[PDB]
Design an enzyme around this catalytic site. Structure first.
Site, PDB file in Angstrom:
ATOM      1  N   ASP A  35       0.832  -1.201   0.000  1.00 21.40           N
ATOM      2  CA  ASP A  35       0.000   0.000   0.000  1.00 21.40           C
ATOM      3  C   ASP A  35       0.871   1.258   0.000  1.00 21.40           C
ATOM      4  O   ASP A  35       1.391   1.652   1.049  1.00 21.40           O
ATOM      5  CB  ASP A  35      -0.902  -0.022   1.243  1.00 21.40           C
ATOM      6  CG  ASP A  35      -1.778   1.204   1.371  1.00 21.40           C
ATOM      7  OD1 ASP A  35      -1.883   1.960   0.388  1.00 21.40           O
ATOM      8  OD2 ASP A  35      -2.380   1.387   2.468  1.00 21.40           O
ATOM      9  N   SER A 199      -0.426  15.611 -12.026  1.00 25.76           N
ATOM     10  CA  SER A 199      -0.708  15.251 -13.400  1.00 25.76           C
ATOM     11  C   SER A 199      -0.936  16.513 -14.232  1.00 25.76           C
ATOM     12  O   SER A 199      -1.456  17.527 -13.742  1.00 25.76           O
ATOM     13  CB  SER A 199      -1.921  14.311 -13.455  1.00 25.76           C
ATOM     14  OG  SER A 199      -2.363  14.097 -14.779  1.00 25.76           O
TER      15      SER A 199
END
Length: 330
Positions: A35, A199
């Site tokens: 994770d 992004s």
């Protein structure tokens, strides 16, 4: 040193991925959820409340000759889905795909929430975010990657998650046969303890690319892609019959639909998520309403590039002194 381990979807929807981990001496192999959105390595154990264990494999520290109670240490964690666990701490030898760390903090669960009990396939979590998020008190503990880092050939790990198929986590090296083209690297902020990056934009299907900054985290421990409501609305508007359902808890769409792809930007490069990756199947068994794999992050407080996004790429988690993230198509 290096390590390499196969990671396998827990179910037919890729809801999560498990990777075998050797703990203790002799080895006790547990299947953990790696994770990158948390920083605790915790396991179901012989100390876990009996009624809260249902089919998981447990770590029994008393059967490990290298286990040592970390005196006074406790841990308690909550995740984005509202699940939680807590307990005490041992140090022990932990190996992943041939890579061994001695003195790793292994957090032994005394309590787990129902979501964990109900999932027989996940024996624990192995956190790969930054160690500043580790919940051990009063002495915070380092992640497996942090403990391994100095011994690794290169201070990196890579996530290569499969679509409805096994994939690979590698430690200490970049497998140049595992991706196409080049890896594009992008800056990381560790200020929140996450692999947080920005992004450069998105496209829906064959639509034009929208240049826009989207701050979010690369999180292997989250199933779906959570993005701003504007972005998500633009995506689902291209799917006839798709709608946001408050009762279901997100966007749903007719199971008869063909989903468009979703592209996200990494610098000047582009990662394409095929439409099929965005289908998470009937909302309930037998339903013709299907759950979408792109959902709004509104009210999460952060955008999350979860497995839906990450599995479309080969992802480099670069833990150099100034960390960065790399993405390649594959």
């Amino acid at each position: 040193s290096t390590g390499s381990a196969t990671t396998t979807p827990i179910d037919s929807l890729d809801d999560a991925y498990i990777t075998p981990v050797q703990i203790g001496t002799p080895a006790q192999t547990l299947n953990l959820d790696f994770d990158t959105g948390s920083s605790d390595l915790w396991v179901f154990s012989s100390e876990t409340t009996a009624s809260e264990v249902d089919g998981q494999t447990i770590y029994t520290p008393s059967k490990s000759t290298t286990a040592k109670l970390l005196s006074g240490a406790t841990w308690s964690i909550s995740y984005g889905d509202g699940s939680s666990s807590s307990g005490d701490v041992y140090t022990d030898t932990v190996s992943v795909g041939g890579l061994t760390v001695t003195g790793q903090a292994v957090e032994s669960a005394k309590k787990v929430s129902s979501s964990f009990t109900e999932d027989s396939t996940i024996d624990g979590l192995l956190g790969l975010a930054f160690s500043t998020l580790n919940t051990v008190s009063p002495t915070q503990q380092k992640t497996f990657f942090d403990n391994a880092k100095a011994s690794l050939d290169s201070p990196v790990f890579t996530a290569d998650l499969g679509y409805h198929a096994p994939g690979t986590y590698n430690f200490g090296f970049i497998d140049t046969t595992a991706y196409t083209g080049s890896i594009t690297y992008t800056a990381v902020s560790t200020k929140q303890g996450f692999w947080e990056w920005t992004s450069t934009g998105y496209a829906v299907g064959s639509g034009t690319f929208k240049s826009t900054s989207i701050d979010g985290i690369a999180d292997t421990g989250t199933t779906l892609l959570y993005l701003p409501a504007t972005v998500v609305s633009a995506y689902w508007a291209q799917v006839s019959g798709a709608k946001s359902s408050s009762s279901v808890g997100g966007y749903v769409f007719p199971c008869s639909a063909t989903l468009p792809s979703f592209t996200f930007g990494v610098g000047s490069a582009r990662i394409v998520i095929p439409g099929d990756y965005i289908d998470f199947g009937p909302i309930s068994t037998g339903s013709s309403s299907c759950f979408g794999g792109i959902q709004s992050s509104a009210g999460i407080g952060i955008n999350i590039f979860g497995d839906v996004a990450l599995k479309a790429a080969f992802v480099v988690f670069n833990g150099a002194t100034t960390p960065t993230l790399g993405f390649a198509s594959k």
